[PDB]
Amino acid sequence: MKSSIPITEVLPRAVGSLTFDENYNLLDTSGVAKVIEKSPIAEIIRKSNAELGRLGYSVYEDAQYIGHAFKKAGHFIVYFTPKNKNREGVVPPVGITN
DSSP states (O other), X not given: OOOOEEHHHHHHHOSEEEEEXXXXXXXXXXXXXXXXXXXXXHHHHHHHHHHOXXXXXXXXXXXXXXXXXXXXXXXXXXXXXXXXXXXXXXXXXXXXXX
16 A cells, blocks of 8 residues: 655655665755654665665655655665655556566
């Protein structure tokens, strides 16, 4: 029901974005991600690193916003969406894992 949603959708739908390093160190904080806490996100980023590839796995679900981790160019970025539940007529493929 959550689904790992592609960045092409999550990027524009996001209202906050956290740029982390591969050492799980916070580099940049933008958008609502500034008022959102970073406490448990690093641990979920690594977990999601194994889980996802180019899709956004929800790492931080709050009553206000929901953050999704993405594998970026040599870095990890978490895009926070305002519980975006509108216009979900797009399905993300489970992956070509064969």
